[PDB]
UniProtKB/Swiss-Prot annotation, chain A:
Entry-annotated residues carrying N6-acetyllysine: 44
Binding site for ATP: 144-151
Location in or out of the cell: Cytoplasm
The name this protein goes by in its record: 26S proteasome regulatory subunit 7
Annotated function: Component of the 26S proteasome, a multiprotein complex involved in the ATP-dependent degradation of ubiquitinated proteins. This complex plays a key role in the maintenance of protein homeostasis by removing misfolded or damaged proteins, which could impair cellular functions, and by removing proteins whose functions are no longer required. Therefore, the proteasome participates in numerous cellular processes, including cell cycle progression, apoptosis, or DNA damage repair.
Disulfide bonds: none
Chief localization: cytoplasm
Organism annotation: Homo sapiens (Human)
UniProtKB/Swiss-Prot annotation, chain C:
Protein role: Component of the 26S proteasome, a multiprotein complex involved in the ATP-dependent degradation of ubiquitinated proteins. This complex plays a key role in the maintenance of protein homeostasis by removing misfolded or damaged proteins, which could impair cellular functions, and by removing proteins whose functions are no longer required. Therefore, the proteasome participates in numerous cellular processes, including cell cycle progression, apoptosis, or DNA damage repair.
Similarity-based family: Belongs to the peptidase M67A family. PSMD14 subfamily.
Top-level taxon of the source organism: Eukaryota
Organism lineage string: Eukaryota, Metazoa, Chordata, Craniata, Vertebrata
Tissue and organ distribution: Widely expressed. Highest levels in heart and skeletal muscle.
Keyword Cytoplasm in annotation: no
Species assigned in the record: Homo sapiens (Human)
Section of the entire sequence shown: 157 to 310 of 310
Protein known as: 26S proteasome non-ATPase regulatory subunit 14
From Swiss-Prot, chain G:
Family stated for the protein in its record: Belongs to the AAA ATPase family.
Superkingdom per UniProt: Eukaryota
UniProt disease annotation: Birk-Aharoni syndrome: An autosomal recessive disorder characterized by failure to thrive, severe developmental delay, intellectual disability, spastic tetraplegia with central hypotonia, chorea, hearing loss, micropenis and undescended testes, as well as mild elevation of liver enzymes.
Compartmental location: Cytoplasm; Nucleus; Membrane
Protein name (database record): 26S proteasome regulatory subunit 4
Subunit text: Component of the 19S proteasome regulatory particle complex. The 26S proteasome consists of a 20S core particle (CP) and two 19S regulatory subunits (RP). The regulatory particle is made of a lid composed of 9 subunits, a base containing 6 ATPases including PSMC1 and few additional components. Interacts with SCA7. Interacts with NGLY1. Interacts with PAAF1.
Biased composition (Basic and acidic residues): 1-11
Functional note: Component of the 26S proteasome, a multiprotein complex involved in the ATP-dependent degradation of ubiquitinated proteins. This complex plays a key role in the maintenance of protein homeostasis by removing misfolded or damaged proteins, which could impair cellular functions, and by removing proteins whose functions are no longer required. Therefore, the proteasome participates in numerous cellular processes, including cell cycle progression, apoptosis, or DNA damage repair.
UniProtKB/Swiss-Prot annotation, chain H:
Native source organism of the sequence: Homo sapiens (Human)
Residues of the full protein shown: 208 to 257 of 406
Family under the similarity heading: Belongs to the AAA ATPase family.
Assembly mode: Component of the 19S proteasome regulatory particle complex. The 26S proteasome consists of a 20S core particle (CP) and two 19S regulatory subunits (RP). The regulatory particle is made of a lid composed of 9 subunits, a base containing 6 ATPases including PSMC5 and few additional components. Component of a complex with USP49 and RUVBL1. Interacts with PRPF19. Interacts with TRIM5. Interacts with NDC80. Interacts with PAAF1. Interacts, in vitro, with the thyroid hormone receptor (in a thyroid hormone T3-dependent manner) and with retinoid X receptor (RXR). Interacts with ERCC6.
Function: Component of the 26S proteasome, a multiprotein complex involved in the ATP-dependent degradation of ubiquitinated proteins. This complex plays a key role in the maintenance of protein homeostasis by removing misfolded or damaged proteins, which could impair cellular functions, and by removing proteins whose functions are no longer required. Therefore, the proteasome participates in numerous cellular processes, including cell cycle progression, apoptosis, or DNA damage repair.
Residues bearing the modification N6-acetyllysine: 15
Protein name (Swiss-Prot/TrEMBL): 26S proteasome regulatory subunit 8
Phylogenetic classification of the source organism: Eukaryota, Metazoa, Chordata, Craniata, Vertebrata
Localization terms from the record: Cytoplasm; Nucleus
């Protein structure tokens, strides 16, 4: 209750900050540029508006297909929004946190080594391969008997150095109502 | 004889009054040209045109005001201000976002010197694309009709894609990257409208080059 | 009708709130009556309207429209309604007779249905009443018909 | 009829459908053309009757 | 205040007074379909009490199927000249619009003008359009208009009983129709258009030969025999093709030659030596 | 100087806002008119004193006031897509003379198309109804669209072209009712010719019930089918249909009425092949020594399009030799070789009847 | 106490029930409600913003 | 006096009862709401289909 007390007591500053930016509805995709000051823009409301932008945003920062905020009164451009696509399919695609470290190997040596140098070493020592390049390979392919399918990837999870990586399940690509997979594969 | 400057002052003051109706050509709408006279029931004659909206409504308004009926066939994108329902100017061209411009290819980094052993068969590729550009003056004399589409096919590689693209930097023509399955969309009629919209700006950007891949997939 | 008045906009620094004899002010600002009407309270104020007579010409102006329904000679259209008094009026009374059979045999089930629903809960049907208009039209028939013995005779 | 007309003139009156009730005295109401709303008591009608 | 009735809305009624094309003397071939339809249409419409006497509830359900041959609308044009009633001519897809809110009012308006202007006959052509099932939201309006088909299915229950309506229905494919529509209690009559037969061959030849000029050389024996080995058909439109091969000319009156030509033109294919079994 | 003031005075007239379009449903009384905006809402309103009740009539497009919602001015009709359909341009004339085969097919279509318009009297005597539809299909050979298109420019009169991509209309497949619009102005502007290309996509058989838009197209049929089973006179108007194969057309379209006649394209005969060869040798420059029969004998079974592609390839082979005048020896080189390559790419060319 | 009599005036009386589309590190959240509408919502109260997550 | 319930049912038994599911549970939730209830198999009895 104390945290909710201080949580609900910030609405007095929140309502003062509630006057600006709350009319930012909605997100709208732009179309073409006729000149520098004037841009044609489309919105999900189905009304396409041609309008100018606010003086607080550099016009050179807006590129065709960029979604931006709008002050519905004046319709002018308010603030651009980097995120565009996609609904929950993306967040389900994202994975985080490690598990299954390297100590879980079952004795495979040349295998695990040759696949270590394709992925982990290029991002561990990028300047090394760029210096001595040539060029690192694109990627690998795993298959065969079940032992051990798919666990070798868990090794890359725990051995990931800094930035987390994303795992994807196969069967979710193919879906009813054909044409959903097209958007799917593209956005990621 | 000096009163012409007085009328000059009133036409500039009215032009300044036009500026307040020119801000801003907000909404996009579609046009239907019409000309009719209505007898009564002393006489009232002229021209009146039908207008669409982006909000699914369709209105009726006297003919603009400013730009005359010299242009054009029923169009769109015409700027009209809120509830005023007056088109100040007719703004081109067409639409829309990625459908307007599929892909903007500046130039590929690769050149034809990175390939070998294709010298015989690269000449047939280079021919169909290069020969129409420079030799049109030769074709008018010889009655020659240039090729258009060329079918390049095989398992990689080959490597058809890279070569076909690389020669496009050497012809300076505008290159538009297009993938086959892109014609498949979640909604119907998208690919049709998409192709029409593709060759539109191709005719606007002429000469240019459009490339597609996996035609066998979308042409079964 | 209506009436308006423009208040001065440059007076916005001083008191904008008269008047004296606020009676007519109170009856005029009422009812308020929606929103658009109230949107004119600022920058504008209404002003009262009252008729004046001129009761002489108003008296004739009443009798002109009222006498419009009356005939010129007054014995013309009443005797034409006496020509009507037997037309097709025996047939118009057959029209009334069909309304009195058809509405009454279904309005004679209503006293029985009142025992089923117990008693006057909604309802209505209808098919209900309507005999008042039938009696009033029949009374018009019998009175215009009673004019016969007055007019035709002398 | 005049005054009642005035209260129903602006917005009229809507037709609500309760998808769920909440213990906070606020009842979830859904309108067919529109989205899902929720509105508080409503003292004339008891909560257990909703 | 409410609608008078009835001033619509849409469609509208009438429009059929300056029409129909031709009387029923045209098609004389069937004779077993007309005995069903006539008894299922003009008899219940003329005398409502005669059914209540004998204690049989006349249905309003009329179902047609079998094309080709076409049958179908020709009967609508016939019954139009038999009796004076209000006729509805509407395309299965005609009422589908951009807003689903217009659907229910539209079917209701059809029916309410029907009951106001009764006796009346309503004809919708190939409702199998709205008989197909889909779940998506885009077809959600199509699902709403098939629940509108169910809503008119409820309104005709409003018509039960007695006064009044008449609903005739035809379809090119009956496999797509849902069993709830064909269920007894609503459509109690299923009329199937049969393939033309010898008795119908000679009738279908007489009717076309009355309108077009004929020759004494032309004989219908070989035309009721040799085409009768397979067809079938469409036979009428091949006679029309004999007219169209006369209009290829430059001809006074058609002879046997053009008929024999219309046979080998359109259409036959063999298909097959695999048939050598029999 | 003063013309500008004329324009500025026009702006003073532009201070009058537009109105909303709407269709006249009925009139309850002379003070009550039932009108329906294109948006869907209905309104019972009045009218001014300039209009006549008799001239209005139901089902009339009119403009309603922004506030009173009453009729001020009316218009007879309007249609936005059709203007595009009346802008098709077909060269020839001469192109009609250059197509060659098939002669007798042309002699069929010339009649079925042109005669009913010029001599309607001959039909009424015999009692034969003029064919209201026709079917031209390929590509067993080619020349479908060309030939019919040439008739558009030969017969002149009116012509209307519709691309098969106009039926979808994304959501709300109302383009089905746009067919009723199409036949509306077909009944106004008559006579007119209408083309339907790639009908197999929009006239399929709904054999396997599935997905979604499979059904909407079946509903577009119903507009075509019911308007050509009318209840309507299409005698003045003409229609042409084309496809890869008459497999999807259903018993509905294979039935007469809608499709009265059927003309299949055939592979160019060697005698006709000499003709089509001739018309492509004209604009081309060759040596004084020429023999076309060598090509006719060497080229068998090719499509009339493929013949022209071969002639052009013979010329496009001469630019490597850079010579201005080109002998037919070099031609037979490029012809023989490249055409035979076309045979290697000719797989799956067999098409059903 | 006073907070219950305060925050209630901000939300009521009418309110709509939408769905969360995506969250921005600027505390502006993009919401989607019937039908096809977007917006920037920034509120510091009752959240629970981390446990919500889009969808 | 118990309620009579039939199995599918087309088309419209699926929409009225939930959005999408096993379809044998949500229906059984209606039969749980009203008891007693009789379930019937209608019909898929044909020679089609033989
Ligand atoms: N015959 C060749 N000559 C020169 N380079 C080649 C040849 N074959 C392959 N390559 C090289 O192989 C690389 C991979 O090209 P790849 O064959 O995968 O492309 P592609 O097959 O055209 O792609 P797609 O299958 O999408 O058309 C290219 O960088 C190309 O330079
Ligand atoms: N005596 C006849 N017997 C059979 N068919 C005929 C006869 N007279 C005309 N027809 C055909 O009937 C057609 C019109 O019938 P109708 O309007 O019912 O079409 P339809 O049955 O709706 O079409 P479909 O069943 O193919 O959808 C005409 O094209 C004509 O060829
Ligand atoms: N008889 C002919 N005379 C001249 N050119 C022809 C002839 N037939 C075809 N062509 C050539 O073929 C091209 C297309 O004509 P057509 O409509 O027959 O092709 P198509 O029917 O689309 O072919 P397909 O049906 O195989 O797609 C034209 O550009 C024309 O140059």
């Amino acid at each position: 209750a104390p945290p909710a007390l201080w949580d609900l007591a910030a609405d007095k500053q929140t309502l003062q900050s509630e006057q600006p930016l709350q009319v930012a509805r909605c997100t709208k995709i732009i179309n073409a540029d006729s000149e520098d000051p004037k841009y044609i823009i489309n919105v999900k409301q189905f009304a396409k508006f041609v309008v100018d932008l606010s003086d607080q945003v550099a016009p050179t920062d807006i590129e065709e297909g960029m979604r931006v905020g709008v002050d519905r009164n004046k319709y002018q451009i308010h603030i651009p929004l980097p995120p565009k696509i996609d609904p929950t399919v993306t967040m389900m695609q994202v994975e985080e946190k490690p598990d299954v470290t390297y100590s879980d190997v079952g004795g495979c040596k040349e295998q695990i080594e040759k696949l270590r140098e394709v992925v982990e070493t290029p991002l561990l020592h990028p300047e090394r391969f760029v210096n001595l390049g040539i060029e690192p390979p694109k990627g690998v392919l795993l298959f065969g008997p079940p032992g051990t399918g798919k666990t070798l990837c868990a090794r890359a999870v725990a051995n990931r150095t800094d930035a987390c990586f994303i795992r994807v399940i196969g069967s979710e690509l193919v879906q009813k109502y054909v044409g959903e997979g097209a958007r799917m594969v593209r956005e990621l | 004889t000096h009163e012409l400057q007085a009328m000059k002052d009133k036409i500039k003051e009215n032009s300044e009054k036009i500026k307040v109706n020119k801000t801003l050509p907000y909404l996009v709408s579609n046009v239907i040209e019409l000309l009719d006279v209505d007898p009564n029931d002393s006489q009232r004659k002229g021209k009146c045109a039908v207008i669409k909206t982006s909000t699914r409504q369709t209105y009726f308004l006297p003919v603009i005001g400013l730009v005359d009926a010299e242009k054009l066939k029923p169009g769109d994108l015409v700027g009209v201000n809120k509830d005023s329902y007056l088109i100040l100017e007719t703004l081109p061209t067409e639409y829309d976002s990625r459908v307007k411009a599929m892909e903007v290819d500046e130039r590929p980094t690769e050149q034809y010197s990175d390939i070998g052993g294709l010298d015989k068969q690269i000449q047939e590729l280079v021919e169909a694309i290069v020969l129409p550009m420079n030799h049109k003056e030769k074709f008018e004399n010889l009655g020659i009709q240039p090729p258009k589409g060329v079918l390049m096919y095989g398992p990689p590689g080959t490597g058809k894609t890279l070569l076909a693209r690389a020669c496009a930097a050497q012809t300076k023509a505008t290159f538009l990257k297009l993938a086959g399955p892109q014609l498949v969309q979640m909604f119907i009629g998208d690919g049709a409208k998409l192709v029409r919209d593709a060759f539109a700006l191709a005719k606007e950007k002429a000469p240019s080059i459009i490339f597609i891949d996996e035609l066998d997939a979308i042409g079964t | 009708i209506d009436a308006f008045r423009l208040i001065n906009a440059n007076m916005m620094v001083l008191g904008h709130e008269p008047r004296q004899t606020t009676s007519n002010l109170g009856h005029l600002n009422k009812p308020s009556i929606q929103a658009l009407i109230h949107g004119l309270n600022r920058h504008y104020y209404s002003i009262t309207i009252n008729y004046r007579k001129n009761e002489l010409e108003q008296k004739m102006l009443l009798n002109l429209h009222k006498k419009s329904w009356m005939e010129g000679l007054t014995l013309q259209d009443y005797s034409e309604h006496c020509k009507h008094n037997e037309s097709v009026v025996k047939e118009m009374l057959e029209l009334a007779k069909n309304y009195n059979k058809a509405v009454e045999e279904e309005d004679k089930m209503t006293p029985e249905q009142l025992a089923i629903k117990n008693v006057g809960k909604q309802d209505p049907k209808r098919h209900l009443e309507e005999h008042v208009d039938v009696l009033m039209t029949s009374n018009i028939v019998q009175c215009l018909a009673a004019m016969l013995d007055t007019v035709v005779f002398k | 009829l005049r005054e009642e007309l005035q209260l129903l003139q602006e917005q009229g009156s809507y037709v609500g459908e309760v998808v769920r009730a909440m213990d906070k005295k606020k009842v979830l109401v859904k309108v067919h053309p529109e989205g899902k709303f929720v509105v508080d008591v409503d003292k004339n009608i008891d909560i257990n009757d909703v | 205040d409410v609608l008078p009735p009835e001033a619509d809305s849409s469609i509208m009624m009438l429009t059929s007074d300056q029409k129909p094309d031709v009387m029923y003397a045209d098609i004389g071939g069937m004779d077993i379909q007309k005995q069903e339809v006539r008894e299922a249409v003009e008899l219940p419409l003329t005398h409502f009490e005669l059914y209540k006497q004998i204690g049989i509830d006349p249905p309003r359900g009329v179902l047609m199927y079998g094309p080709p041959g076409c049958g179908k609308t020709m009967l609508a044009k016939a019954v139009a000249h038999h009796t004076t009633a209000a006729f509805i001519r509407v395309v299965g897809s005609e009422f589908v619009q951009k807003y689903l809110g217009e659907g229910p009012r539209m079917v209701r308006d059809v029916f309410r003008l029907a009951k106001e202007n009764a006796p009346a006959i309503i004809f919708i052509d190939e409702i199998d359009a709205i008989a197909t099932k889909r779940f998506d939201a885009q077809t959600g309006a199509d699902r709403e208009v098939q629940r509108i088909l169910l809503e008119l299915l409820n309104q005709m229950d409003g018509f039960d009983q007695n006064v009044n309506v008449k609903v005739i229905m035809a379809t090119n494919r009956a496999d797509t129709l849902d069993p709830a529509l064909l269920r007894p209690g609503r459509l109690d009559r299923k009329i199937e258009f049969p393939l033309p037969d010898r008795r119908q061959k000679r009738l279908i030849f007489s009717t076309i030969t009355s309108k077009m000029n004929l020759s004494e050389e032309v004989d219908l024996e070989d035309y009721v025999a040799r085409p009768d080995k397979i067809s079938g058909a469409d036979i009428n439109s091949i006679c029309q093709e004999s007219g169209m091969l006369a209009v290829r000319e430059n001809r006074y009156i058609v002879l046997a030659k053009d008929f024999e030509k219309a046979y080998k033109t359109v259409i036959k294919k063999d298909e097959q030596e695999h048939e050598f079994y029999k | 100087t003063k013309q500008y003031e004329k324009s500025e005075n026009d702006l003073k007239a532009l201070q009058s806002v537009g109105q909303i379009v709407g269709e006249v449903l009925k009139q309850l009384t002379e003070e009550k008119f039932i009108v329906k905006a294109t948006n869907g809402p209905r309104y019972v309103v009045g009218c001014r004193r300039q209009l006549d009740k008799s001239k209005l009539k139901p089902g009339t497009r009119v403009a309603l006031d922004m506030t009173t919602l009453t009729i001020m001015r009316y218009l007879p009709r309007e249609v936005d897509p059709l203007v595009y359909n009346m802008s098709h341009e077909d060269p020839g004339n001469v192109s009609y003379s250059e197509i060659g085969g098939l002669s007798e097919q042309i002699r069929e279509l010339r009649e079925v198309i042109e005669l009913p318009l010029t001599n309607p009297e001959l039909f009424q005597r015999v009692g034969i109804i003029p064919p209201k539809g026709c079917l031209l299909y390929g590509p067993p050979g080619t020349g479908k669209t060309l030939l019919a298109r040439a008739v558009a420019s030969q017969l002149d009169c009116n012509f209307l072209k519709v691309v098969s991509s106009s039926i979808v209309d994304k959501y709300i497949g109302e383009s089905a009712r746009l067919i009723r619009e199409m036949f509306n102005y077909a009944r106004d502007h008559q006579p007119c010719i209408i083309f339907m290309d790639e009908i197999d996509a929009i006239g399929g058989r709904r054999f396997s019930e599935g997905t979604s838009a499979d059904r909407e197209i079946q509903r577009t049929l119903m507009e075509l089918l019911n308007q050509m089973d009318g209840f309507d006179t299409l005698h003045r108007v003409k229609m042409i249909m084309a496809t890869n194969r008459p497999d999807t057309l259903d018993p509905a379209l294979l039935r007469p009425g809608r499709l009265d006649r059927k003309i299949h394209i055939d592979l160019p005969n060697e005698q006709a092949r000499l003709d089509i060869l001739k018309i492509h040798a004209g604009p081309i420059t060759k040596h004084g020594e020429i023999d076309y029969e060598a090509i006719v004998k060497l080229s068998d079974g090719f499509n009339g399009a493929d013949l022209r592609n071969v002639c052009t390839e013979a010329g496009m082979f001469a630019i490597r030799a850079d010579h201005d005048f080109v002998v037919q020896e070099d031609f037979m080189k490029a012809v023989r070789k490249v055409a035979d390559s076309k045979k290697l790419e000719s797989k799956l060319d067999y098409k059903p009847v | 106490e006073e907070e219950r009599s305060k925050v209630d005036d901000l939300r009521g009386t009418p309110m709509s029930v939408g769905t969360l589309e995506e969250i921005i590190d600027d505390n502006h959240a993009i919401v989607s409600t019937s039908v096809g509408s977007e917006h920037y919502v920034s509120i510091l109260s009752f959240v629970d913003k981390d446990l919500l997550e889009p969808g | 006096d118990c309620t009579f319930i039939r199995v599918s049912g087309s088309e419209l038994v699926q929409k009225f009862i939930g959005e999408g599911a096993r379809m044998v549970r949500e229906l059984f939730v209606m039969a749980r709401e009203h008891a007693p209830s009789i379930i019937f198999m209608d019909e898929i009895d044909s020679i089609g289909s033989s």
